[PDB]
Symmetry: C4
Subunit: 355 residues, 4 copies
């Protein structure tokens, strides 16, 4: 594999159609899904030359831990959909690569099992109708050694996934939400209906700023709000005591027509003015994309779909190869741009171009 695109081709070959669609798809007309790519493609970097590159390092310190790259594996629910080893395969590869792994509320292997892999993991939280279940998950995550709580704030309910609706997508019997008893809702098959979407409407309570405060009071871990796009919500996140935010439109899966995170990132970085870490996701497909995100001010990126392509294609080894490729591309891009550190990359300037 010489690019991430090689992995998508590999994953389309092996996965069942409806599972590839669950992975690839977005909400509505997929405008936001496509815009995440368009937005990155329009950014050009203004590289610097003739700087010392005798010790180029791609490492960052984030949430009290050194990471090998300015990158983490995004939370992706139900990883057993893509490979039998699911989250364990991805977590092992991430650990070995020195990349944080985000354990999901809707993981198909229990959070404690995934945490036992090691690698100082993060935990993604969905707010549930019974608050106590969500706060218990936070405490479980913390007890298990997770190092940050990534509270997803852009899913009061699931978006309208037309591929899933048309496919009548439902979880296979052998994939479950291992952190719960989540009931049978996501497994029932109904025509023209996404079973996971009606499961979400039944199970999820919309989170509010009060929910954020309840989480912040319940843990010593940094709380990271994922799904922020409005500048004032970024500012309020800092005021609320968040240790970070992820500037994100949920991979185009939530509001169709939501601005790409990459388009809000610079304005958000300026507004928070170092008050929290500012991550971004959506459409990161190369080390050069990582560099672009960094140059726009991101502390780090998340990568979602490509990690699942690698998992589907070749399990743990596939994820390892993806992370090695990304690591090489990030090092390459940084050095070619005159950056011996991620901090230097954040000081790069950019210019918008066309198509």
């Amino acid at each position: 594999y010489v690019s991430l695109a090689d992995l998508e081709r590999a994953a389309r070959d092996v996965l069942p159609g409806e599972i590839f669609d669950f992975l690839a798809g977005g909400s509505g007309t997929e405008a936001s899904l496509v815009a995440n790519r368009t937005a990155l493609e329009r950014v050009f970097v203004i590289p610097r030359m003739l700087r010392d590159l005798t010790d180029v390092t791609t490492e960052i310190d984030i949430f009290g831990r050194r990471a090998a790259l300015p990158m983490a594996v995004a939370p992706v629910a139900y990883q057993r959909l893509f490979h039998p080893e699911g989250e364990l395969a991805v977590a092992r590869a991430a650990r070995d690569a020195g990349v944080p792994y985000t354990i999901c509320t809707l993981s198909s292997v229990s959070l404690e099992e995934i945490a036992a892999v090691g690698g100082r993991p993060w935990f993604q939280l969905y707010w549930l109708r019974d608050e106590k279940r969500s706060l218990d998950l936070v405490r479980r995550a913390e007890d298990a050694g997770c190092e940050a709580i990534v509270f997803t704030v852009d899913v009061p309910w699931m978006g309208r996934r037309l591929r899933d609706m048309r496919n009548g997508f439902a979880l296979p019997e052998w994939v479950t939400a291992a952190n719960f008893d989540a009931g049978t809702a996501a497994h029932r098959r109904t025509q023209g209906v996404s079973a996971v979407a009606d499961h979400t409407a039944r199970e999820f309570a919309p989170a509010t700023w009060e929910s954020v405060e309840a989480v912040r009071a319940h843990t010593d871990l940094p709380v990271v709000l994922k799904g922020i796009l409005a500048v004032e919500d970024a500012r309020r996140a800092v005021d609320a005591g968040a240790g970070g935010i992820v500037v994100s439109n949920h991979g185009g899966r939530q509001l169709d027509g939501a601005v790409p995170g990459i388009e809000m990132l610079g304005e958000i970085v300026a507004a928070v003015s170092g008050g929290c870490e500012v991550l971004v996701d959506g459409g990161i497909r190369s080390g050069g994309d990582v560099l672009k995100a960094t140059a726009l001010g991101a502390s780090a990126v998340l990568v979602g779909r490509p990690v699942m392509w690698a998992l589907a294609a070749a399990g743990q080894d596939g994820v390892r190869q993806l992370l090695e490729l990304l690591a090489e591309e990030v090092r390459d891009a940084m050095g070619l741009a005159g950056c011996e550190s991620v901090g230097a990359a954040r000081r790069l300037n950019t210019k918008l171009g066309v198509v």
Copy 2:
């Protein structure tokens, strides 16, 4: 049906070619028709997160009536072209959905029959060569319980519809202008000539600001000027006593090269500064599009062609299904954007993107 696009496919299958073309087409090169879509596709919403969504409502108050959505059915002439029940089918579905229905001057069922369906309808006015006929129509509409007069101001005559000209389109014998004796002009078949266009040139007198004043003096109902695009015309509409305007290029059917309404909407909303309701139409094809229009400042939208797709596909039940789908999409988009009310949606910010 999981999107409005499903209905267009359904309608193309069933309708005769020349009738589908009468419905789908625009004037000239169809530049304005296409631009209505392009304009919406370039707008991205900046959603808000973590707000209370315990009682999301899509309702608005407009022209003294609560509507279930920030949407009305646009005036579309000659609905019996699309289904035998024509306007009655659409009006019944709109009534049941709590959506205002606009009865047309050129309705193929009489305005009194359509009004008798109930649902507190609006009445669209074309100015006719004999003024008295137009003012009599206004009084008929008011007597029949219509709640607003939507005076269409962008048709001094009909645009050059090249599809209709090439098809030699004429009304079938069984479709007539039921509010009149409209003569035989729209039924005569002449090669290279749109019969409806030469009927319009013969029948319609260009409206002026004096015509608006004559209407305003003849009724207690709110007068809504449909087809406003210039900021100064919006301002003058308020000065003239209009209760609303519809910012519109008539679905790309009138001046080819007219700016899309969606491109003028924000500037118009700022200029009228709450002095009248500001509606928009042209290319609204989803709840997300409704949200975009609302975020740009619209009080409500009109929807034209999709309602006719639904009517053609499945009559009253088709229109019902379309309105239920739109209602769900509007609720979904609003909540995902952090808006518990349409007023909150109007306070959303937007950002232009590419393609």
Copy 3:
């Protein structure tokens, strides 16, 4: 014919390939040729509503003569290439339509014959190596009743027409420059070489501001400089005593990469501030395009290729039909935009859109 595009299709059918290419083509990569269309397509008009349209007139006064439309037939060399009646057919149709016709220095029928058709024609001047021949042409034109001298200033030599080079294009024996003895240069056939281009390099002297003054001193007729794109050249044209300019890139046939005239027009109109007439050409293909040009400030447009399509398709009657179609489209567009006169159309505002 219901659009100008109908005529291009008709002309491609009938004309020999190399002649269609001589007509259609531009210089270099044809970037400027395509940009002339792109530039118009990006302009949208903001129409006005509710104005008095009881006496819509498309007439203008220009160079001391009333014209039926804000339009003239552009100078196009060698019209016998397209139809045996050549310039006489086009001039007769233009006369009958009340549209000025521009007689070319390189007309294939003598300027006196074309002038005898009537219709108060204009005369286009190329500066020749022997100055006296060019000044004699000016005096011939004036003696014959031409009413303006359109001095083409963007052809110090002919552009690189790659279609003509690849075709080895040369004039047929039966088409000559009837105002001269122009020699045999444009008729000799050489592979990979445009015979008309090497004829031009041999025959034409580059014009300068001194040439303009020589012409201005030699005639009482208004001198109109065709091919102006720089704002300072427009200003200097006024200072030099020009009665008009044509803002033009010569239909993309001269400098490949020259800005479209339509893109410079507004700035030029502002800079000359009523000091001369400001015409534009390049890519005008409808009455709506005329309206756009007018709204950007043009006094009038020239139309080139479409007139030749009409000539090729159906001779004099073809040109008549084209001019009738354009007249109807201009009237239609003006009225739909709320303009009872061309002056009102010049006061319309515009907005740039995308694709």
Copy 4:
């Protein structure tokens, strides 16, 4: 050949696939490669009219030598890949055309042999791990009569060339780095690996500002820094004593996502404010492109790939024909734009357009 595009077609026919790919390709997704073309295509020139063109000259003075055009042949490694005569063929044609030729550190014929051709050549420097080898090359170049040192500053290592990786590209046995003993690294064949890229990582030391000073102190020749894109790096180049810079993204072969040089050129020209020569390269494919670069402020351009197309197609004679074509196109474009000298072309204004 009537355009440069004719030569690319000719070269694709004759060259082996992997060699054409080594020539044509860029790094990563080839975003920067494509953007070099897009960037030029968006620029339009505002030509001037009516200026004296009695002695149009395309000549410039640069680095103490008159050049026939504002153009030099870019450094392109390993020219024997394209034709058996390699660099000698290109250098002879450049000499005969009066165009500077840039001899490469990685030339496949020794720099002294190429210099012996005559034509006052330039020498391109790569910084090598043993500094002394690079400084010895500079002294060899100077002793051999090279007139400028073009220090390439954008290759701390070679970019990720995915075409070369996929092809497993390696130099054929009969092509070597003739200025060295360069070892066997670039010839070894490894699957999924570019042999030239791992040779570069092994052989090249990243250059720094200290390296620039070492070169500047070692020669009396002008030092020209090739690969500058940041405005502050251009300013620093002047402060460092550079006689010129080449604003360049290395033909899209280095950082994928690097801004095109043409997009930075105007800002760089303003910032250096005559303190050094400012050249540009990337995607120059016609005399009109040269004119655009000049109008944006360039002193001269480099041309890379097209020279190799010509070499591959027809050897020395091919390169001669390419340079004659470019010379004619530059003269044509300049005159059509009203420029009797390159200095006048630099005073032209430009306007951005679309696609």
